[PDB]
Each structure stands twice: as C-alpha cells, then as structure tokens.
C-alpha cells in the first residue's frame, strides 16, 4: 500500500468534546501535536467500505490554502477499531460555536466580515478542484476558527460514501434544489453559494437559521412550501444585495465565489 | 407480550391504537399531515420515512425515496428504507417483512409503530 495512515496506538485520547449521528470527537495528543480525533460511526462495516475510506481520505489532505483545514491523517480500520480522522486542534472550535455558543466577548462585525472573506477564499479554492471533493456541505458547523481567528473550511467534516446517504442533518444551509435532486443532477458550485448566503444571514443576525423548526420540517418546508430566511432589516445595501444574489432562486444566477471575494475584500478593515 | 395483546385483549388493543394515533400525529402534524387510521396510511412507506426523520432529527432528501409511490414495488422500497433508518438509529431489524406493511397487515403495522412509540415516546 502507498500509505499505512496513522497508528491508532500512538493516539492519546484526553477529553471527549462531542458526539452525534456521525461519531465522537475527542481532544488528544499525537506526536507532539494537539489534535481532535473523530471516530466515525458506521453500521455493517466491510472490506469494501474500508477500501473506500482509504481511497477517499487522501483528497482531504489539502495543505496549500490558509482557509482550508486538512485532515492531518487517518487510521485505517482494520487495524484500528473504527475508521478515524485526525485534525489539528482549532482553539475556538467551529464557526457555529463562536457565533452561537460564545461565553465571553461577542465577535464584532469586522471579525464577521473577515470570517466571510476567509470562507469565500477557501470555497473559491475548493471550487478549482477537479473533480470537486464529493459530499462536502458548507455550514457553520463545518468551518473551524483557528488561534488568530482565521476561518478554515473543515475537510474532516466531509461525508464519506458509506455514511448516512438519505439523512441530512443541517438542511437550513442547503439549496432548495439540493433538497430535492440527486447531486449528479445539480450544479454543486451554485448550491454551495446558497449555503454561503445562509452563512451571511447567520453572521448578520447572530441567530441559527430556522432555529424554531426540526430538521425534517426545515427541509420539507424549504423544498415544498417556499420557506426562506427573512432578509434582515437595517443592513447596508451592498450586504443586502450580496445576500440576495447569493441566495437567488435560480442557481444559474448565483455568483461564483471568485466573483464575491473582491466584494468582501472591499468590505474589510485595512 | 405483543401477540397475546393483539389476539386476546381487545380493549387493551383499542388503547394501543389510540395512543399510536396520538403519537404519530404529534410528529406528522408538524408537516401538516394527519393520520386518521392505522390500517392503510402507513402501507406506502411515506409516513414511516417522514416519521423517522421527525423522531431522529434529520431531513430525508426527496430523491432518496418515493414521496408519491405509484406501484407496489416503490412502496416496498420506501418501507425497506424506513426499516434501514430504524436500524441506523439502533433498533433491531423489524420482524415483519416490508411487504407485510405494504399489504396492510394490521398486526405488522402496529408492531412497527409500537416499537417506535416505546423508543421515541419522549421526543418533543
């Protein structure tokens, strides 16, 4: 084999951070690094799925862009007890954590704009890849915030071929067409721009989108009943314009990330 | 317990039917869907799919199942998908075959619904 991956025996598990439908996250140490260990949850593991994990992981190892957070390595299973991903520990956690679960100063609107620019840069980069990294969904849980407050798109949050294919757990950020059509039948780049518009919404409101609804309700109402985020009042014209065009009903009228980067760069403090 | 109750305990069975109608509507009514009878409204698998997303906190993308099944085969596929979702959440493989639900076998339908109720009865 070309790579054997990380040796599971070398990982020191320190503290449990989280658990959900996808697996468990633990803070740890490995070869002098502070890491997060993601132990994936899978039913009916097989040789085929193991082979797939090992072929899918190397695409996640992106070390050339400051706004992309790579997978540092992965533990192949067998011989690890379960398929596992390792990433460097990002001290502020996810964008979601920072915006919605902060315990201290509230991040200011300058910092929010810098988050938006960072995310757009990272997405513009990921959109240059051929083919696109499959099953990558942008949302506030899948962006991490590093020590100097840089936002980085999290490659460990990409779903694998064997994970939960018909279960969507963050539909509020998903484009209406993507709630209804197979990925093969949608323009994935345009769908990703909707997700970015919802993240702009979240940065403006500092609220969780559709926080009062369950995930099923959200997807059904967005897909079939025209439910949309309400454009917030009292915002600048160019923020309003940008959110509206990024969230256009027609996927083909939404901009490319590399066409919004220069708008966001003007909006920054310098 | 379940088979004794179904075949021999008629009043206990009506309380089970009523509790189950209340339980499924508590969730389905969030989507403006209403169940009035257990005998046929789960047979096409659609509500079972929708219910599983309501109980376990996900949406099911509309291309993953048949929202308006136009054949026996499509219904069977829906119900089989719903049973996978139940297993993904930690239930054992259900006892009825998916075909038993599509063919409106009451005992099969109520056993599936009763195992959901037992596990998920405290979900808001």
Residue numbers in the entry:
A (entry chain A): 183 to 452
B (entry chain B): 249 to 372
Provide text from the study.
Integrin-linked kinase (ILK) is one of the few evolutionarily conserved proteins found in FAs to critically control the FA assembly and integrin–actin connection. However, sequence analysis suggested that despite containing kinase-like domain, ILK is a pseudokinase lacking several key active site residues. Our results reveal that by recruiting FA adaptors PINCH and Parvin into a heterotrimeric complex (IPP), ILK is able to trigger F-actin filament bundling via two WASP-Homology-2 actin-binding motifs, one from PINCH and the other from Parvin.
On the other hand, another major puzzle still remains unresolved, i.e., what is the role of Mg-ATP bound to the ILK pseudoactive site? To circumvent this problem, we carefully analyzed the ATP-binding residues in the pseudokinase domain of ILK structure and designed L207W mutation that does not affect the structural integrity but sterically occludes ATP binding to ILK. To validate our design, we first examined the propensity of the substitution by characterizing the recombinant ILK KLD L207W in complex with α-Parvin CH2. Consistently, CD denaturation studies revealed that there was little change in the thermal melting temperature of the mutant ILK (L207W) complex (Tm = 53.9 °C) versus that of the wild-type complex (Tm = 54.2 °C), demonstrating that the L207W substitution has little effect on the stability of ILK/Parvin complex. To further prove this, we solved the crystal structure of the ILK (L207W)/α-Parvin CH2 complex, which showed that the mutant complex exhibits the same interface as the WT complex, yet the substitution of L207 by more bulky side chain of tryptophan in the pseudokinase domain precluded the binding of ATP as well as Mg2+ as expected. The mutation clearly abolished the ATP binding as well as Mg2+ binding to ILK. We note here that Mg2+, while interacting with D339 at the pseudoactive site, is predominantly chelated to ATP 13,14 explaining why the loss of ATP binding also led to the loss of Mg2+ binding. Next, we examined the ability of IPP L207W mutant in affecting the F-actin bundle formation. Strikingly, as compared with WT IPP, loss of Mg-ATP in IPP L207W led to dramatically impaired F-actin bundling with notable decrease in size of the formed F-actin bundles. Consequently, the mutation further reduced cell spreading and migration. It is important to note that like WT IPP, IPP L207W binds potently to F-actin. Another major finding of this study was that the IPP WH2-mediated F-actin bundling is highly sensitized to Mg-ATP bound to the pseudoactive site of ILK.
